Design a protein around this ligand. Structure first.
Ligand SMILES: [Cl-]
Ligand SMILES: [Cl-]
Ligand SMILES: [Cl-]
Ligand SMILES: [Mg+2]
Ligand SMILES: [Mg+2]
Ligand SMILES: [Mg+2]
Ligand SMILES: [Mg+2]
Ligand SMILES: [Mg+2]
Ligand SMILES: [Mg+2]
Ligand SMILES: [Mg+2]
Ligand SMILES: [Mg+2]
Ligand SMILES: [Mg+2]
Ligand SMILES: [Mg+2]
Ligand SMILES: [Mg+2]
Ligand SMILES: [Mg+2]
Ligand SMILES: [Mg+2]
Ligand SMILES: [Mg+2]
Ligand SMILES: [Mg+2]
Lengths: 613, 613, 613
């Protein structure tokens, strides 16, 4: 095993942990480069033996409350199928052939499933829209989408109740009722901001909440768990969790950090928080108790009789763990790979920027006492993203190729106070960019072997914006790779999936008259660019549509700049990690070669035919 | 036969007339709604009998100079094939299997073909671009495209010479040499503005012209025919024609009208001009002589021993004609259809607008002396398009459904003086929009049965811009249909295929700082809209990309307006006429029903599922 | 070449002669046993050279009036296609893709075609009927069928007018009008008995005739040719022909024979008559003139500038001939085959039966002066069929295998006086059966080498009835082969396609109370059968449905008789001649082996697995 553009295929990727009784289930995913497909296997472990059994070419494991059965999905006919297996022998029957189903959940009776899906107009030749937005990242054109809710009897194998709601509605069981969360409608739907919440049973409903900034995420049959706030002024405010049983009770009213995920089982709540680069696991049982806190990201968890969770670190993809008073590692899927593959632990540093003290990290490559090394600055997305202790392939890969890697959490990031997150609103490219510069300055001080004359910068999404911006506002950088970014806020407002509300918040109100939409946009400062730039974009990214890269590309070419554009024919906003294996391999090889040829040692041109094959 | 959304399928569509000796060849096209395909048949007529023979599932007829053979193209394997047939018996052999060939032309020897095509990078997963623009309407993503030139021996069936040039190059035979026209390169290629022209033979070339605003279109073996000007300041200047034999000689130096098409055969030049709504055919033989001038559009022509041409009118698709001193109609393909299908001849009117007198037309529907009728205003594209005497399906169709149809040639249109065309530059939405208003005002004066309270407006491309604009600047209109339009000039500049140079000319220089890019853009005046609007767009339109409709749609919805968007999944800028038959049928039915339900008699909503099926 | 069950595949089968000017077209059909398909080739002969050209995998040749073009049909998609070719080079275009088209005819303009076809309900799971009958032989279940009429422009390639009529309507051109013949409706449609005739043009019609017993068959643009009678009491009456130009004029009022086919060209009528075993060709030009009269059947003919016809004989399939004052044979397709294959000319004899003198024929096999030979009696269908001088494969084949063949025209047959035909009505199995017995008795007198102890009998349809009947009413016969017959008239009345009207005529009125329906039915006399019988039936025979064979089979088995049944899975009433080649081969081999094993020399059983392979 060596680091290159294919190494990501050698890892086992775990997701969707579930537990009932003495059993754990989860999904093992492999990127198969030869077939160009992801392969999914459900693994069921019996904590009684450490014994494993399998359900092949399947995902979405849902263990029935009684622990007797497992439901799952399989995906010729472009149709999904819901299956049920007995957990003892894993013999299985097909229950329903289920196109456009997004979720499945058991009722407490271990007989009925709730499935939530969607339906669209589906004309062969044209999409027709009369609501907003017209598209959504990783979903496609809405085409008049409505949400569908089906109650499925797994014994008789029939939809026994069904109903529809507006697009982007969700539903959970609450005993024998269904809690339904629907975006609230004003001039447009208030997506990610306000919901109406209903209690549905037997074809009738009652409204529980009107225009609240939380939605229902879980239930234990007596109490409903709510996620968000009673009322947000900004979508960027920290989401919290509340127990509802008649009265709404905050259980983290005093903790100024955002909840990543949360579940309730038997009146206890298990939850994770974004905290200064980590995603940490806690329990609330009347008080908040630490379960798994460290330099790591708790990516998923479940609890029933046992508590299990997936923990990723800066140098290892997720593995599964069990907590019984102390943490026990359950799986070691990548252990043999990693015995042969060098990894680089980031070094944390603090630095001052303006009025704040912030977190940065860096990775130092294998160099000897007399040598200097080039530097890649990475900028995370969001702006309310967060770097720290998750596994970032490009950083390990570039470190292995002789680069320093440097990255910080500027104001606007998740993982800190709410106020720290909100500082970025209407200030994109201002103090946050200064924080990145100040982090780099401190890093250079700490590492005199870092070659100040060969610093590059890269990022995706907000990180792509900031790469664009950096090359227009500073002469520090020798090369840039900007991916799925922003060059012009006004088109983000009006063209992107979330722009109508999110740009109002992050950039400002009255967008057609607000000067900040030009003032804080890289497009308008294109003349300033002096460093070679690679723009990467994908055709199904509706979060940051194509214009954001292609306009910047054309305008930079109109100004005589050295710029290149790679337009991946498939893929949404997250394609760098969710595209097809072969697509992702080609992106990684482009990324590494652009920095080899423009940053480590500049050479003219970029003959992609030669460089890639 | 009745008028509705399918009637366009009942017509025979003729194109690509060719003549050598006593023979005429042309292509008969049918839109087959059931198969959802266009069918192409070459027809060869012998003017000796009016006898016809056929080459089925074929196009691009090219008769050899000696009149003995015909080359043609056919299109399983996504591959084009070049074939040669003997003209006596039409027995035929396949010569070359020819993906991405755009043109075929015989050498004077009746043995060699010149084929011009293209080649691209072709990676399965990503497009890579390092030139400009990254895409072109009706061509796709360039993906590093180069032009390819092949000399093909039709006897031995081999490419005997080949070479490449930059994208958007063209080539013609000139005796045993090839005249090669290549876009001139400054900071970017000067597309539609400057070319370098070379004379190529046997792998060597000499430059004939450098940075000239014409390219080579034809040759008679002694003289080269050039199209354009020696130097244009604006691409919008009238294109003229010149004979080159050592010296460049203008042959229309005194005629202030633009050439539509031109050919040279035996030192005579045949050409058409855009003239006040007509496209008229002339000959130059030392002086300019009228051949076919009237209320018509000469869509294509060829000349050798005989002169033939295709003539379309306001009420008939093209038919073929021969001129031998007087015009004789040769074909009557749609004669039986039109005996059963009512058509409406437009009435021409003049009107004053500001400082000018302009041409308008209108069609009056079957109404009786006591009734009033709604009105649809059509606006042509361009801005240097031209309405008048070609067959416009929607106008006939809507007239048949009880609507007045009104349309003018505002300043900026083709068909008048050069200065009249150039008036629009930096003034889009200003005097030209006034011309449209003044035309409507005169039409209403002329037709008191026209219901001033039910006037709608529609257009495609620049006509879509002007529909957008009209609904933002006037309260006259009750409904709009805007197709493949412009809402924001700055994104047209930076995102569209031609924007980097064409918007500079039509909107203005320094686009990132020029206030006219906001001042003359409908997007910024969305709050003003009061009339229901249907936006139509297609996903392969790179001339006016999607943002132009979808941004306007989202912003109008953000402002609480009644607006709808139809996004056709396939189709370039011209999809209303070049999309698949079923696609076009669905567009026509949407178009007619939106006006039925919003203009003739307003009703709420637009249930496209119900309205269309 | 030898006689056996495959020999029929070695012949060329000609049909559908057409002539315009100096050209003749016709269809050459081959039975391909290996592919199990019929192959059809149009042959065009130029009487100028005896030169031939071809249109492969095509039929229904229709030469345009101007002689410039030929329309034809071709039949993957279960769709028929209408094509047009230039007759000079035979280059061809597809004009219309034409499922369920039954006929095509040119207008006098050589531009428009009239196509007549049908349309049905077409539900995948069930046929639904509310008219009568529910099915028709060689057509299938009607499923609510209506007749469709399309006028097709072959230039523009469009249906320019269309209309529908009740099932079993027909249409011809009459100049620029269409003459439409529709079955007249009383309690049910009066199929084969009364029609209403209309003149149709441009979507309007006028009734020409009401409830008449003729329909329109041809026109020369001035006069309409009508076929039938002004009023028939019996459908079995001889059909005659009449010219209509305002007045209806009989042109064969004095000739007591039935017209087989007739055409009008330039006010002359060419027609054939059924005459004492021959089908003979005449002309009427004011008087009736003999053209081709002899021991033959004129199977088809056409006339324009030249007169051509297909002539079959007892020993040769049809060949083409031209008449220019004398008959010239044009084709000799089977001439080489027949040089090697022995044939047997029938010997005509007269005999007395009751009150009449009748025609019989027999064929004597190669036997020497001391030997006797078995005898097969063949009975033709109808009852108004006719034996004589057409090519009957089974007779030649059995003669070659050492059998006498004997066959007569009993009363009821075509080819004689009308009264002779009508004698059979209400008398089936009575005097007609006596005529067959008396013919056999005279034949035995004429041929003492005919073995009276080994006489068998066979027939199809009415001939199958009479085979059934003979075995129940006589002890003369040693074996029978009854095919697609009648055993019970009452089920013929109520189940068959034509029974509701035809059985009323041939058997009698008031069928539910008329004793003749039992008295003249073989089923009721099954106990009498002593000779082995093979019943052959086919599953798509709606003229004589399955019950007619299977009931007789079951009842004979219930009575302990030696009987066998072969049920061909496909095939209509005429399957012995129109079934697939392999189907027909297997029938011929069954037929010959049953007589070998039951008639020539009786052996027990019939092991069809062994006997056939
Ligand atoms: Cl079950
Ligand atoms: Cl050749
Ligand atoms: Cl034609
Ligand atoms: Mg692998
Ligand atoms: Mg099942
Ligand atoms: Mg869809
Ligand atoms: Mg949040
Ligand atoms: Mg605060
Ligand atoms: Mg059609
Ligand atoms: Mg070849
Ligand atoms: Mg490609
Ligand atoms: Mg021009
Ligand atoms: Mg001027
Ligand atoms: Mg054969
Ligand atoms: Mg066709
Ligand atoms: Mg059917
Ligand atoms: Mg008859
Ligand atoms: Mg009589």
């Amino acid at each position: 095993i060596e680091w290159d553009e294919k190494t990501f295929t050698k890892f086992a990727y775990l997701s969707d942990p579930r537990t009932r009784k003495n059993l754990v289930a989860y999904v093992l995913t492999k990127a198969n480069l030869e077939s160009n497909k992801y392969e999914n296997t459900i693994v069921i472990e019996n904590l009684e033996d450490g014994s494993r059994k399998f359900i092949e070419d399947a995902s979405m494991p849902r263990i029935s409350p009684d622990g007797k059965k497992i439901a799952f999905m399989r995906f010729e006919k472009k149709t999904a199928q819901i299956w049920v297996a007995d957990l003892k022998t894993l013999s299985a029957k097909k229950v329903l052939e289920a196109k456009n189903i997004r979720s499945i959940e058991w009722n407490q009776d271990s007989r009925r499933l709730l499935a939530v899906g969607f339906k669209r107009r589906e004309d062969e030749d044209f999409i027709f829209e009369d609501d907003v937005p017209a598209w959504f990242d990783n979903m496609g054109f809405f085409d008049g989408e409505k949400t569908t809710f089906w109650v499925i009897d797994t014994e008789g194998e029939e939809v026994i109740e069904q109903f529809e709601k507006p697009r982007f509605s969700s539903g959970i069981w609450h005993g024998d009722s269904i809690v339904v969360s629907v975006p609230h409608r004003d001039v447009i739907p208030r997506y990610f901001k306000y919901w109406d919440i209903y209690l549905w049973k037997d074809g009738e409903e009652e409204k529980l909440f009107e225009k609240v900034s939380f939605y229902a995420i879980d239930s234990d049959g007596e109490r409903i768990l709510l996620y968000g706030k009673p009322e947000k002024k900004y979508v960027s405010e920290h989401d919290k969790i509340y127990i509802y049983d008649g009265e709404v009770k905050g259980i983290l009213d005093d903790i100024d950090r955002e909840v990543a995920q949360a579940k309730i089982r038997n009146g206890k709540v298990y939850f994770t928080l974004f905290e200064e680069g980590s995603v940490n696991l806690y329990l609330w049982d009347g008080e908040v108790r630490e379960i798994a806190k460290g330099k790591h990201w708790i990516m998923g968890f479940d609890a029933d009789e046992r508590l299990i969770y997936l923990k990723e670190t800066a140098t290892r993809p997720a593995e599964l763990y069990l907590w019984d008073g102390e943490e026990r590692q359950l799986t070691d899927y990548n252990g043999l790979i990693f015995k042969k593959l060098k990894t680089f632990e980031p070094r944390h540093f603090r630095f001052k920027s303006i009025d704040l003290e912030l977190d940065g990290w860096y990775i130092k490559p294998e160099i000897k006492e007399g040598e200097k090394a080039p530097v890649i600055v990475f900028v995370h997305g969001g702006p309310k993203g967060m770097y720290g202790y998750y596994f970032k392939y490009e950083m390990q890969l570039m470190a292995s190729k002789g680069y320093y890697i440097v990255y910080v959490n500027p104001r606007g990031s998740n993982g800190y106070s709410e106020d720290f997150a909100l500082r970025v609103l209407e200030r994109t490219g201002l103090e946050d960019f200064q924080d990145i510069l100040n982090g780099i300055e401190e890093f250079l001080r700490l590492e005199p072997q870092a070659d100040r004359e060969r610093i590059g910068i890269t990022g995706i999404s907000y990180g792509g914006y900031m790469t664009n911006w950096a090359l227009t506002q500073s002469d520090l950088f020798k090369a840039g790779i900007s991916e799925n970014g922003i060059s012009y806020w006004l088109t983000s407002y009006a063209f992107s999936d979330i722009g109508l509300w999110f740009d109002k918040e992050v950039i400002g109100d009255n967008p057609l008259e607000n000067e900040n939409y030009r003032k804080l946009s890289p497009l308008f400062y294109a003349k300033n660019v002096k460093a070679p730039l690679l723009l990467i974009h994908s055709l199904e990214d509706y979060r940051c549509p194509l214009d954001q890269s292609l306009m910047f590309y054309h305008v930079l070419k109109d100004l005589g700049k050295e710029v290149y554009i790679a337009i991946f024919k498939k893929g949404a906003h997250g394609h760098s990690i969710r595209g097809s294996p072969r697509h992702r391999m080609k992106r990684y090889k482009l990324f590494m070669e652009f920095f080899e040829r423009k940053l480590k040692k500049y050479e003219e041109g970029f003959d992609v035919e030669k460089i890639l094959k």
